[PDB]
Assembly symmetry: C3
Homo-oligomer: 166 residues x 3
């Protein structure tokens, strides 16, 4: 973790011992990583200018960049590969499809979803149970029962997956 955890302005990340951090991830400055979280290969959480909080049981998948107004990510959140997250707030069980961009001041409420490849623009609010999609992302429809159930299942799957590394 000597190469993985980087200080900025005297602040170093606080990482729960049960979190999985890929050896080539980079976590800089004011970043807190909760119990059973998993931060994947090539992910960059750059908390130099403002803070990043990552809740229990959250996965931030490969090559995602988080940087900024801080970034607050709740519990059991799934962030797909190669996302870009910028001073946003993601509620518990939020699901961000791979290849999505979430802009400054955007909010995903608890149990909401963004389709793969979405661009959620500044200040937009995805409400609980909603699926948004597109560029710029807009409300598409409510989620099905299967999709809602998958929010927690995805997070649990990733906790289990990450335990096969450590």
């Amino acid at each position: 973790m000597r190469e993985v955890l980087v200080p900025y302005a005297g602040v170093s990340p606080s990482v729960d011992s049960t979190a999985f951090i890929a050896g080539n991830a980079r976590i800089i400055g004011d970043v807190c990583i909760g119990k059973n979280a998993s931060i994947w290969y090539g992910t960059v959480l750059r908390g130099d200018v403002d803070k990043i909080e990552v809740g229990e049981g959250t996965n931030i998948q490969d090559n995602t960049v988080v940087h900024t107004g801080d970034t607050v990510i709740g519990k059991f959140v799934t962030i797909g590969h190669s996302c870009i997250l910028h001073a946003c707030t993601l509620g518990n069980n939020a699901f961000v499809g791979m290849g999505s961009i979430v802009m400054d001041r955007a909010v995903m409420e608890e149990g909401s979803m963004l389709a793969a490849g979405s661009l959620l623009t500044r200040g937009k609010i995805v409400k609980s149970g909603e699926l948004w999609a597109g560029r710029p992302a807009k409300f598409l429809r409510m989620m099905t029962e299967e999709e809602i159930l998958y929010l927690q299942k995805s997070a649990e799957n990733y906790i289990a997956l990450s335990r096969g590394y450590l």
Copy 2:
């Protein structure tokens, strides 16, 4: 390759000795890399949950993520920078434009192409000789003679390019 090749659940990648693997690439678990393939900087081939196969003479360019239903990539395939490939099948001489996302169960037939920045959604089939583009990607037109010739040329160029590293 000690840092580059990562075991998962007792399985480590099988890499042909003639393949180029960038020193900061990460290849995990059940992944097979063929003769003269080239896997570029910051690429992540994560074969933890299911297998990834990469055929002879294929290039997977920088910062691409492959992860999942397995991912089967044929021979002399070009995958551009910063793509995301998810349980898909790419036939020989398929060409995936940089910054594209290929979703679960999508298929590119032999000698087909996706434009840069495309989003090929679940289960869609790009037929041989076709060029698809957009988000969601849809049929645009057939490829020109020059474009069809370029499928093999791109792959050969990358084999030659990669030999200047090793």
Copy 3:
């Protein structure tokens, strides 16, 4: 910098001593990096086939890939996270929004801007003072006074930010 700077065909990068280069960046071959530039985590500047020039005071943010017709990037340019730049020319004070793709032969004139998530296609010219957006990117509007001022401010902010690492 032993792992960061990579020779290709006998050519190694030329990096100003005042430039910040993240320890996991990869800079290959014919690449020149100017005074006070900053090249961020997971960025790949691959100057194997042709040259890459990066002017004074320019930031190229995390996980961006630059590769190709060469790539000429001027002074005090801001390139956002996870961009892909391909044989293009970016004038002084150009601003490329995060998650954008700039294709071969595209030009951004001095003091022009691309919105986040744009796809600037081959040979397109963004004129000074213009904001382009979309996929394919097209002229949206001229920039406001605040936006024009921000071009230089962004670059100065990044110089200052990078000095807290070195």
